[PDB]
């Protein structure tokens, strides 16, 4: 079902300059925010503290605060150590969290990327380089794997704290999590590349949660030339998708954009091409190009 992600973006320009911004996602809803200039992690939901007590949370925050500055300096040193092997600028990405399951079952992970390539994970008890990782990493890993304190803290964040803290969120956010926002669909078109051909675009916007079916139709028959675009975010935590079909000019009459979604009950959104509403909405859209 759900996946918890703590996301860390660390950027090092030279010896003097660096910053670490973090974001936190349960499923596809952002739960936390940690800007470099803030000393404290900020909730982005009312229910962000999950089920943890004020001091339970503080324990966690204070641990993370220490980690941040500690990690910064540690990287800086790792550079000093890899004297010509690697050099600023350096970009580091962390992805750490949980996969939740039925149970009281749960799987945990901590992945590190370096310059945008996945290189190092944590696994069981130690740090490990992954297949295809640059072989010069072998040393720093050894140097870091000597720190049994860091290892035991990480083991606790991954094995216990994470699956605990997120079960906490799943309750505290249940309402927000399972919410239905109804999609809102509108047709348009542009001229296709090919002469005497048109491209018809069916806009779907404002839906939640993510699964959505969008197809162009001639009656019951699904038009196979339908191309779904990528899921694009709205800022109000809803989604936008568009499906474009390509056809000969004049072939549009009788075509319809069928939408299926969990928010709609059994009632599929069917937009026929030259509909009473298409005609009118398109009129509200005219522009000078």
């Amino acid at each position, epitope marked *: 079902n759900y996946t918890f992600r703590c996301l860390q973006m660390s950027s090092f320009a030279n010896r003097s300059w660096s910053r670490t911004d973090s974001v936190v996602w349960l499923g596809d809803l952002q739960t936390h925010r940690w800007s470099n200039d803030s000393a404290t992690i900020s909730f982005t939901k009312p229910w962000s503290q999950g089920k943890l007590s004020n001091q339970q949370w503080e324990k966690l925050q204070h641990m993370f605060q220490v980690y941040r500055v500690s990690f910064t300096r540690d990287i800086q040193e790792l550079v000093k150590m890899m004297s010509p092997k690697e050099d600023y600028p350096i970009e580091i990405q962390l992805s750490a969290g949980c996969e939740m399951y039925p149970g009281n079952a749960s799987e945990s992970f901590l992945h590190v990327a370096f310059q945008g390539k996945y290189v190092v994970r944590f696994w069981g008890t130690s740090w490990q380089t992954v297949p295809g990782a640059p072989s010069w990493l072998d040393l720093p890993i050894k140097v870091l794997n000597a*720190d049994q*304190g*860091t290892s035991a803290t990480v083991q606790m964040l991954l094995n216990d704290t994470c699956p605990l803290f997120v079960r906490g969120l799943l309750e505290a956010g249940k309402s927000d999590l399972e919410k239905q926002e109804k999609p809102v669909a509108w047709l348009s078109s542009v001229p296709s590349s090919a002469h005497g051909h048109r491209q018809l675009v069916c806009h779907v916007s404002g839906f939640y949660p993510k699964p959505v079916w969008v197809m162009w139709m001639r009656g019951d028959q699904e038009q196979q030339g339908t191309h779904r675009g990528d899921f694009l975010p709205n800022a109000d935590e809803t989604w936008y998708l568009q499906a474009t079909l390509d056809v000969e000019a004049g072939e549009e009459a009788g075509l319809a954009c069928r939408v299926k979604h969990s928010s709609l009950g059994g009632q599929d959104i069917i937009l026929y091409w030259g509909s009473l509403h298409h005609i009118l909405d398109a009129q509200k859209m005219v522009w000078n190009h």
Partner: T-cell receptor
Amino acid sequence: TQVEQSPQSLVVRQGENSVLQCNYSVTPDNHLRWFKQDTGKGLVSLTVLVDQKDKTSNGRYSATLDKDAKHSTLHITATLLDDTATYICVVGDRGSALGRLHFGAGTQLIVIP
Amino acid sequence: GGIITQTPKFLIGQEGQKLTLKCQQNFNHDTMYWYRQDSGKGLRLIYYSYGAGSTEKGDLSEGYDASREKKSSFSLTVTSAQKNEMAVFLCASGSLLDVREVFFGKGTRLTVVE
């Protein structure tokens, strides 16, 4: 600094037990360790403490550390005339070789016959 | 199993003179340090290193430079000796896989005559 040792000078009778104190603020506090320095010489390692509440003992020396309290004590049992050299509390801030050492200003011991 | 040694034990220097002090180590230690002991202050790092010819500034690097010719060896240079200067210079080496594995030498005592 971030490591305060007390008192600045101790005086004890030979054969007596002497107690040396060290408080800190260094963070994280991976480990604390004690050093003996004879006049005009190097730093000799006495004992190394790691755990949240740790006790270690080498030879005469016995040392305890409370992390919660950010405090450490060094005991010398049956002090001898040798024990004259100054004593240095040092906190390390990483369990990796990346981490370094934060030095206390030291305590002179003066063993009277 | 072996020793870390600083030469010379004692050193006579004059105002504004350039001063060097070697430190050798056969522990196979990759990290090597140069501290300064000031009466009533405790050790302050001047220069460290992770091997030849890595040299990295510590909190007291101003007024000195250092050079690591080889694993076994680490030299510090005092650029301009102070007028009445008196200081002890201590050298330490360390394992990269054991934060703790740090061993010190027997110190170097500098007197600036005048």
